[PDB]
Amino acid sequence: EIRAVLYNYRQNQELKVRVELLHNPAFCSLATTKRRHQQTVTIPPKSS
Amino acid sequence: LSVPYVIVPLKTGLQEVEVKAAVYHHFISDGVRKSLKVVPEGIRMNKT
Amino acid sequence: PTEKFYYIYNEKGLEVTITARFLYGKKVEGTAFVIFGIQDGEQRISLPESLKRIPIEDGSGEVVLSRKVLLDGVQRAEDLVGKSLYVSATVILHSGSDMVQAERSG
Amino acid sequence: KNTMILEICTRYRGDQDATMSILDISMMTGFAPDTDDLKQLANGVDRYISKYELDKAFSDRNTLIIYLDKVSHSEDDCLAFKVHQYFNVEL
Amino acid sequence: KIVLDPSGSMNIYLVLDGSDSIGASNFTGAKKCLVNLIEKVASYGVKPRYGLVTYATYPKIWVKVSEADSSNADWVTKQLNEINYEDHKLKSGTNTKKALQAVYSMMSWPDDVPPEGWNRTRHVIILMTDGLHNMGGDPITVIDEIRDLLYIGKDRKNPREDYLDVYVFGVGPLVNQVNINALASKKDNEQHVFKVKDMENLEDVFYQMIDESQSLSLCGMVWEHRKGTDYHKQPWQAKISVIRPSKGHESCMGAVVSEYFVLTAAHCFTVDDKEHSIKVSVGGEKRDLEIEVVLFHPNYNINGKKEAGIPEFYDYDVALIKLKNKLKYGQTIRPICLPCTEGTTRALRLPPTTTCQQQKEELLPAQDIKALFVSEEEKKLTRKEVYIKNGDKKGSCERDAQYAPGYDKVKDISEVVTPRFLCTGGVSPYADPNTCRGDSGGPLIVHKRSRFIQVGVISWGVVDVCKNQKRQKQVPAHARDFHINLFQVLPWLKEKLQDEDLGFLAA
Amino acid sequence: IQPGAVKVYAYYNLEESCTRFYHPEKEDGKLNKLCRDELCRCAEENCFISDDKVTLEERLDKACEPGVDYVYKTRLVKVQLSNDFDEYIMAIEQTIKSGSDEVQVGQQRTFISPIKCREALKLEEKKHYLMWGLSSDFWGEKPNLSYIIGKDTWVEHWPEEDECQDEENQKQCQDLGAFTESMVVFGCPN
Amino acid sequence: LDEDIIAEENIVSRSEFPESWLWNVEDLKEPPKNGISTKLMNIFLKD
Amino acid sequence: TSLPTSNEYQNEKLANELKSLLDELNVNELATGSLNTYYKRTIKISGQKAMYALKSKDFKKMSEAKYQLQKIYNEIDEALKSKY
Ligand SMILES: *[C@@H]1O[C@H](CO)[C@@H](O[C@@H]2O[C@H](CO)[C@@H](O[C@@H]3O[C@H](CO[C@@H]4O[C@H](CO)[C@@H](O)[C@H](O)[C@@H]4O)[C@@H](O)[C@H](O)[C@@H]3O)[C@H](O)[C@H]2NC(C)=O)[C@H](O)[C@H]1NC(C)=O
Ligand SMILES: *[C@@H]1O[C@H](CO)[C@@H](O[C@@H]2O[C@H](CO)[C@@H](O[C@@H]3O[C@H](CO)[C@@H](O)[C@H](O)[C@@H]3O)[C@H](O)[C@H]2NC(C)=O)[C@H](O)[C@H]1NC(C)=O
Ligand SMILES: *C1O[C@H](CO)[C@@H](O)[C@H](O)[C@H]1NC(C)=O
Ligand SMILES: [Mg+2]
């Protein structure tokens, strides 16, 4: 398992983030050539 | 940005001029309520 | 002024910088009216031929008093030695709303 | 909705009871630990969950950290907490 | 803003608009915002000469500020409550100038003679209109006329702006705000303009229009506004802590009975515990206060029954705690009322001839009494309403003490449950909540007349339904709570709190 | 549109400056204002003036509006006229609705109107009129006030006693008469 | 009202424009540390 | 029915959290009647920003107004503790 920390250092604006892991034939994940493995999380202000 | 305003004092004494302004889309505003002295028509003198 | 004095044999002349900024710190944009003159104990002699009108960009301005005009202000450079020069600036915003008069003397 | 149960059992392969260890947990995309269950495991001795991790609510808590004061080397120290689905997404 | 004290007479001129622009939905709600006021005003003890005038095109004087009944809130409320909207439906006009014109006479003394110390009287006009007035001129001039009558704003160093508080409630939908403000009093750092929405959550409204300058001392008084912290609701409440070797930390509670004293259970401490091992936390501030001495009740003894088989004896389980520093009463730090005192007398609004026995009857009648005890849940002071089994069920409730730990092999129940005890909890007549270990020493209060009177002190219980940091699930029917009746230890509280200037009844 | 302005002055002296205005219509930028002696007002406003369908209901509504302050049945006694504004000294014969002005029946309250409104209502002498306006039309300081016949001023001709007999003025005599009683004892419907 | 802006009735104008304020007097009787007392004042900045 | 989706949750949660503050808006707004003009000026402005953001259901404006309205609340809470 690899970590991907998304930092948000805005004053008072929680961010609606869309993170995606690009596909790569060298690795085997949920993301394939025709399928995108993308989440849609939210990050509180001045936090990660 | 300067904004002109033509006015005509009617009564003497410490009167009150008030202007307000708000921006569209942005939720900001600021009003100013300063006071100016309204003196009649006379000239200083010191008769002996 | 670049120097806190003036060298009589200085070709460049008396260089003066006009700095104008709002009370809240922000820089000022406008036009300034700067003049010079010589002082003698209590008497002042204005120099009409030194009147300049320099723009004020980025809250800064640059004005110079050429030695040529200075000497022409009187009628013996070594004589002016001991006297003093005074600068009188007057900045006016591009909005023509406010006006300030500054002055450096001595 | 679906609400499942996550049970974790561990043991130290040493002669002595391992000291203070850490439990790094990663939820299944669309699952958040039950708040109430976390309080229970927190108040319990030999276990600790920082206040920072507590008041996060179902939303942002995909990663959990349960600090342990010790782990037995004889038998297995097992704990369990409830998890709820709030996101629903295929695969 | 609105001085509040019997040290001077006051006046409340209630003017209400009853024209068509108000409507039945807001006129009825306009009365509620005057009825509840009188109650919260009388709860402070002050006795204002109420004036009530409903107006439209021609006002209708219900109550005059000169009558002898203008000081009986119970009657003024009756009148206001009986005031039917459609009293005048013919003249839907809104002549406000005329209404205030009548109010002028209320304070307009009879001719060339200023009454006894007239100027010391406060004047408060509470007009409830929608600003939309058709008939008459501008009611502003009236405010300027009254401005002179009360000799206000007519002197240099003596403005007298403290004797005129004009409040305006914008009732009805479409309301001319511009007009209202002009009428309302213009004072700095004060509020006099209230609108429709303000109605909901009335407590918040009353807050602004009240300053307890001289009622900073009144006991059992509580603010209920939503913007109030836990201690704004329970000022008397106090959190006591006992630190000692191998003792971890003992958690108990108490109630501020005086400037220097705090009442709590006597079983929370011991002769061994020192005075610097006990810290009292009053309200909110995590600033512990050093105590001076713990006054245990002379009759207290938890080991008095080393022979009979009663490991723990909770009889006379009361102890006062004199703080090392004097407390200054605030919105979050106020005393609670104690039985058989001058405070409780005026708190219950009873004649000066009220005896100690009459209070015990009103507070603790032979029946099911509505009581309550303050408890903390996750650092939150929540109120728990319970019932006192003082009636016939008193026996059925007290006999459940045979289930208590170390209370099985007991000769007699009247040996462990002394008359010094009140009984609560159970499932009759209602499912009463239970007290936990942390709540020990908590006050047993009887909410009456908007005031709070303490009549008991949490001593012990039968079942610990409050396991550990929790409480609920499956509570036994014999889960009873016992509290030390403050009437049974009167002579003691009457002895220690003698110099606290409380005013105990010599009777 | 707002009148422009041009200011001239030396760089060394701001006090000694001169400023002129300019407007495509108005004199020289100077706004419109009515003034007498040393008492001027913001006359920057409109005027006030074929008998559509004035009924008993059309009046009860416009006579119970917000600004509605005063309502009188007056009789014009004297008519003076100046080069900068006219006026009418009318005596109140009854106070249908008392306003901010404490006036008893019989006294005279001065009314003022622009010289351009001489064609509005030719207020003849010794004739009755029903009028009502706003409190913002008051002019001067109490007790010496003065009414202003502005845009919100209602001026109507009140027929005489022996004029309601005419079979053409009856429709108005009954409306005015009913409007009177509907105001003195009853009041506005709001 | 529905516009993405603030109405006139919701704009509280700034009026307090003093040229010189905070003409107060404070004594330093606080617990001294290294001969240097420290008082924390909560002032109300003008408009 | 089963469950929400991507923008189906976070966008609703923020809406609820913003509404919770808007409910007790009149409570805080009326609480500045005794406080200074600053609090009365800040809350009447931060008030609309929260309402307009709610109806728009815009994640950005709702959050932007949530802390805008939350800050002023806290500043009022502290402004009262100096008054008891
Ligand atoms: C009573 O009345 C008199 C007359 O009005 C007032 O006297 C005037 O008051 C002011 C303040 O004292 C004086 O201002 C001063 O002006 C001087 C001199 O004027 C100068 O003249 C020389 C030579 O021409 C030049 O420098 C200039 O032309 C300049 O005008 C100036 O040097 C000072 O800087 C100062 O400002 C003014 O002079 C004076 N006017 C007169 C005397 O006519 C007086 O204030 C008033 N009050 C009382 C009770 O005495
Ligand atoms: C005083 O007058 C006001 C203004 O007329 C009254 O407020 C009104 O109250 C009703 C009932 O609560 C509200 O109706 C509601 O409509 C909403 C939809 O917006 C709906 O969700 C509710 O279920 C209810 O049907 C109404 O909004 C409101 N009118 C307004 C604010 O324009 C009030 O009832 C009167 N009483 C007092 C003393 O407040
Ligand atoms: C009235 O009140 C004032 C102010 O308290 C007081 O000084 C005075 O003695 C009182 N008597 C009268 C009627 O002036
Ligand atoms: Mg009405």
DSSP letters, E437-489, are: GGGTT-EEEEEETTEEEEEEEEEEES---S-SS---SS--TT-EEEEE-TTTT
CA H28 to chain centre: 10
CA distance F65 to F73: 18
Report whether E504 contacts E357 (CB < 8 A): no
CA distance E390 to E364: 7
| Touching chains, B (3+ CB pairs < 8 A) | C, F, G, H
- The encoded tokens of residue E152 equal 């206000």
Is any ligand 3 atom within 6 A of the Cβ of residue E108?
no
- The encoded tokens of residue D21 equal 């260890």
Provide the edge-to-edge strand list for the sheet that holds F86-97: F147-148, F108-113, F86-97, F68-81, F128-134, F154-158
CA distance E263 to E374: 14
CA distance D12 to D77: 10
Q: What is the CATH number of domain G1-47?
A: 2.20.130.20
Of B27, B32, B34, the CB nearest to G6: B27
- CA-nearest of E225, E219, E294, E301 to E255 is E219
Neighbours of E324 (CB within 10 A): 13
CA distance H24 to E131: 27
Residues of chain B with Cβ-Cβ distance to F2 below 8 Å are 4-6
* Strand F108-113 versus strand F147-148 pairing type: parallel
**Do both E207 and E247 map to the same domain?**
no
Per-residue CA distances from H63 to E478, F162, H59, H68 (Å): 51, 77, 6, 8
User: Hey, what CATH class is H1-84 in?
Assistant: mainly alpha
- Report CA dihedral (E94, E98, E103, E105) to the nearest 10 degrees: -160
- Report CA dihedral (E354, E355, E356, E358) to the nearest 10 degrees: -70
Report whether E323 contacts E261 (CB < 8 A): yes
Length of chain D (residues): 91
Domain boundaries, chain C: 1-106
DSSP conformational letter for A25: T
Structural domain total, chain E: 3
Amino acid, res. E342: E
CB contact under 8 A, H9 and D59: yes
Angle (deg, nearest 10), helices H6-23 and H37-56: 150
| Cis preceding-peptide flag for E429 (omega within 30 of 0) | yes
Residue A43's φ and ψ, nearest 5 degrees, are -120, 125
Report whether F99 contacts E137 (CB < 8 A): yes
- With 0-12 / 13-18 / 19 or more C-beta atoms within 10 angstroms meaning exposed / middle / buried, residue E300 is buried
* Chain E residue at shortest CA distance from H39: E189
> What technique solved it?
X-ray
- Chain D nearest-CA distance from H63, in A, is 15
Buried b (16+ CB within 10 A) or exposed e, E107-145: beeeeeeeeeeeeebbbbbbbbbbbbbbbbbbbbbbbee
CA distance F67 to E123: 30
Domain boundaries, chain D: 1-91
Report whether A39 contacts D29 (CB < 8 A): yes
- Chain C nearest-CA distance from F11, in A, is 7
- CA-nearest of E281, E277, E276, E284 to E262 is E281
Give the containing element (helix H, strand E) for C48: strand C43-56
> What contacts E441, CB < 8 A, 6 or more positions away?
E240, E252, E253, E254, E264, E265, E268, E457, E458
Task: Report the CATH number at residue E205.
Answer: 3.40.50.410
Task: Report the CATH number at residue E282.
Answer: 2.40.10.10
Amino acid, res. F73: K
- The answer to whether residue B2 neighbours chain C at the CB level (below 8 Å) is yes
- The encoded tokens of residue E412 equal 């007699």
Residue D4's DSSP bridge partners are D83
Ligand 4 centre distance from Cα of residue E135 (Å):
9
- With 0-12 / 13-18 / 19 or more C-beta atoms within 10 angstroms meaning exposed / middle / buried, residue E184 is buried
Residue E279's DSSP bridge partners are E241, E290
Report whether F126 contacts F76 (CB < 8 A): yes
CA distance E481 to E371: 12
Q: What is the CA radius of gyration of chain F?
A: 21
Ligand 2 centre distance from Cα of residue E450 (Å):
29
The reply to whether E133 belongs to the active site is: no
Owner of token pair 């005596």 = F91
- 3-state secondary structure (DSSP) of residue C64: strand
Ligand 2 centre distance from Cα of residue E172 (Å):
11
Three-state SS for B1-48 is CCCCCCCCCCCCEEEEEEEEEECCCCCCEEEEEEEEEECCCCCCCCCC
CA C39 to chain centre: 14
Owner of token pair 């204005």 = C46
Report whether F63 contacts F175 (CB < 8 A): no
Q: Find the domain containing E385 and state its range.
A: 337-507
DSSP symbols for D39-80: HHHHHSTTEE--HHHHTTTTTS-SEEEEEES-B-SSS-EEEE
Report whether F90 contacts F129 (CB < 8 A): yes
Q: What is the CA radius of gyration of chain H?
A: 15
Domain D1-91 has CATH 2.60.40.690: yes
The reply to whether E267 belongs to the active site is: yes
CA E367 to chain centre: 23
CA distance F107 to F101: 12
Per-residue CA distances from E499 to C14, E108, E311, E355, E495 (Å): 85, 46, 37, 21, 9
Residues of chain F with Cβ-Cβ distance to B11 below 8 Å are none
CA distance F158 to F176: 8
E480: left (phi over 0), alpha (psi -120 to 50) or beta: beta
- The encoded tokens of residue B29 equal 């505003």
**Do both E426 and E394 map to the same domain?**
yes
- Listed in order, strand segments (DSSP E) in E7-118 are 10-17, 51-55, 60-63
The overall longest dimension of chain F from CA atoms, in Å, is 79
- Chain C nearest-CA distance from B26, in A, is 22
- CA-nearest of D27, D1, D89 to A38 is D89
CA distance D33 to D51: 15
Alpha helices, H only, E150-224: 177-183, 202-208
Give the containing element (helix H, strand E) for E93: none
DSSP conformational letter for E172: S
- CA-nearest of E498, E460, E452 to E295 is E498
Residues of chain G with Cβ-Cβ distance to H40 below 8 Å are 12
- Report CA dihedral (F103, F105, F106, F109) to the nearest 10 degrees: 30
CA distance E148 to D2: 75
Report whether E215 contacts E44 (CB < 8 A): yes
CA distance E178 to E132: 10
Three-state SS for chain F is CCCEEEEECCCCCCCCCEEEEECCCCCCCCCCCEEECCEEECCCCCCCCCCCCCCHHHHHHHCCCCCEEEEEEEEEEEEEECCCCEEEEEEEEEEEECCCCCCCCCCEEEEEECHHHHHCCCCCCCCEEEEEEEHHHCCCECCECCEECCCCCEEEEECCCCCCCCCCCHHHHHHHHHHHHHHHHHCCCC
CB contact under 8 A, C99 and F12: no
Residue E131's φ and ψ, nearest 5 degrees, are 75, -30
CA distance A24 to A46: 33
Ligand 4 centre distance from Cα of residue E98 (Å):
13
Give the containing element (helix H, strand E) for H63: helix H59-81
- The encoded tokens of residue E250 equal 């003992």
Is any ligand 2 atom within 6 A of the Cβ of residue E308?
no
User: Hey, what CATH class is F30-190 in?
Assistant: mainly beta
- The encoded tokens of residue E453 equal 């009177």
The overall longest dimension of chain D from CA atoms, in Å, is 45
Domain boundaries, chain G: 1-47
Residues of chain G with Cβ-Cβ distance to H44 below 8 Å are 10, 12
Give the torsion sign (CA, E12, E13, E17, E18).
positive
Report whether E310 contacts E407 (CB < 8 A): yes
CA distance F28 to E356: 89
Report whether A41 contacts A19 (CB < 8 A): yes
Owner of token pair 């995606």 = A20
Report whether F129 contacts F149 (CB < 8 A): no
Q: Measured from the CA of E33, which atom of ligand 2 is nearest?
A: 38
Owner of token pair 């302050």 = F69
Report whether F155 contacts F120 (CB < 8 A): yes
CA distance D39 to D34: 9
The overall longest dimension of chain A from CA atoms, in Å, is 40
- Report CA dihedral (E94, E99, E100, E102) to the nearest 10 degrees: 160
- The encoded tokens of residue F131 equal 């009028």
* Strand E193-195 versus strand E165-170 pairing type: parallel
Owner of token pair 């600036």 = C89
- 3-state secondary structure (DSSP) of residue H52: helix
Alpha helices, H only, E328-371: 342-347, 356-363
| D62-D63-D65 Cα angle (round to 5) | 145
- The encoded tokens of residue B38 equal 């309204």
CA distance C27 to A6: 38
Annotated binding site for Mg(2+): which residue ranges of E?
19, 21, 94
CA distance H40 to H72: 10
- CATH topology for C1-106 is Immunoglobulin-like (2.60.40)
* Strand D47-48 versus strand E261-264 pairing type: unpaired
